[PDB]
Amino acid sequence: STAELEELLMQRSLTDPQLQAAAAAAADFRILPDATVIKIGGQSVIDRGRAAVYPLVDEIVAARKNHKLLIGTGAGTRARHLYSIAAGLGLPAGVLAQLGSSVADQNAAMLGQLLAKHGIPVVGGAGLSAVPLSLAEVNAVVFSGMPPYKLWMRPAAEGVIPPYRTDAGCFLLAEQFGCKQMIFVKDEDGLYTANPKTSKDATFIPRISVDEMKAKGLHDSILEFPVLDLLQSAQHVREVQVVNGLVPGNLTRALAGEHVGTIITAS
């Protein structure tokens, strides 16, 4: 009933459960259903320079013949330095958000310049107006991975580090556009039972639900912990895959739908 929804929208508060339930029955349009969102890790990939980025640039150029890619960048070490300065001053999470965004912008600019000669642009602006044309024509765009919350960033329960960073920024774009998948490109095969960099014998985990991660204490391990909650609330992207971008071909296979790293499912 478009009329009962229209009637509730005019006459009730948007907080009214009846209106909320009526809105949930609305049709569900996917804006870019054939596109895939990829995050290129800031700390895990871009901060590693040529030996990490150049092979992934080659994979992206090869992949954009068969896949439509929205390529988001993490921020990494320079954002961590900015957070340490600003948090040491007691500046609130809303102020730090801007700082992390500029680092993600730097990394999108650097990645984008390696791809410019292939026609692939860096896109920005509140509306991301350059995405539809670029995606139709050169099958890929590069964007900065931070969400645009700025001073309206929701703080964590404790501390001033912004809890929604470039994992969330990339995941939410995949969800908003109704993309067919979301692939996180990092520097490890996927999720382990502990940090594989500091843990003697952590066990690789190839598939896990959000609830299983939380029960194992892995909520804030491989992805920003709020991304697990966004994942469970998501309408369109109900799972994600994390892969090792340092291994040639992992991104390519993942784009084709292969199970190559860790698949994290909402349910």
Binding site: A24, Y149, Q235
Partner: protein, 259 residues
């Protein structure tokens, strides 16, 4: 004063974030108040005019009925919540343009969200009040879950007020405050006025509120604002009384500790 307070060995709360605009008063004008047109807006403009020499004001407008209409069209088109959010935020901006124009001769202008985030201190040194949109610029990155954008005008205005560490946030409504049920809804016969409530109590409740439910969630992580009063802007003088801390509507306790 409690035995636990005296215990030298218990964990100590972290310091609060530094306050950016500690002398600022934030006032959120409901879109549905603006929707009443001149009958409501003209007395509110005269009240605001008299507050300018008393307070430094960030006046943030909500969206009102037009956002319900664009939601109706957008939902019929199937659009996701990150498409609906900037369409509604636009309506809050238009209410801000209208309200600022009414105060232009007093030196008041509407400013866009980049200016609010970054240059508010300079503009509030220039003039006594500025107007902005109460909606946050979440745009494509609105949270999924509900098909209705959760972070709306109350929520944006509180996030700003608490990030600034402002002296207060007052929400100006078309009703006296929060009732136990919609005082204009099918159960308005059962509606009981709540002079005071905590956000945690409101969050556990189910049923409609005059404030965003996300407002209660961001109050739980608030660092500075201890209370927010919802007052009836259709009653002249209640905004003025609320800005001086007089209890003329519903006080919501955020759960931030005072000491």
């Amino acid at each position: 004063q409690t035995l636990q307070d005296r215990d030298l060995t218990r964990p100590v709360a972290g310091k609060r974030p530094i306050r950016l605009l500690p002398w600022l008063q934030v006032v959120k004008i409901g879109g549905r108040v603006m929707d009443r047109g001149a009958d409501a807006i003209l007395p509110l403009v005269e009240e605001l005019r008299k507050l300018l020499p008393e307070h430094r004001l960030l006046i943030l407008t909500g969206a009102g009925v037009r956002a319900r209409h664009v939601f109706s069209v957008g939902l019929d088109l199937g659009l996701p919540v990150g498409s609906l959010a900037p369409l509604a935020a636009s309506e809050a901006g238009q209410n801000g343009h209208i309200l600022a124009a009414m105060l232009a001769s007093e030196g008041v202008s509407y400013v866009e969200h980049p200016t609010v985030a970054d240059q508010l201190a300079i503009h509030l040194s220039a003039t006594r009040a500025v107007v902005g949109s109460a909606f946050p610029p979440y745009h494509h990155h609105e949270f999924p879950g509900s098909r209705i954008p959760p972070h709306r005008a109350d929520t944006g205005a509180f996030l700003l007020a608490d990030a600034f560490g402002a002296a207060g946030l007052t929400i100006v409504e078309n009703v006296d405050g929060i009732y136990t049920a919609d005082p204009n809804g099918p159960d308005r016969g059962q509606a009981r006025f709540l002079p005071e409530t905590s956000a945690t109590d409101l969050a556990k409740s189910e049923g409609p509120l005059p404030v965003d439910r996300a407002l209660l969630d961001v109050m739980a992580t608030a660092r500075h604002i201890e209370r927010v009063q919802v007052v009836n802007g259709l009653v002249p003088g209640r905004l003025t009384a609320a800005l001086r801390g007089e209890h003329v509507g519903t006080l919501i306790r955020t759960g931030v500790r005072p000491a």
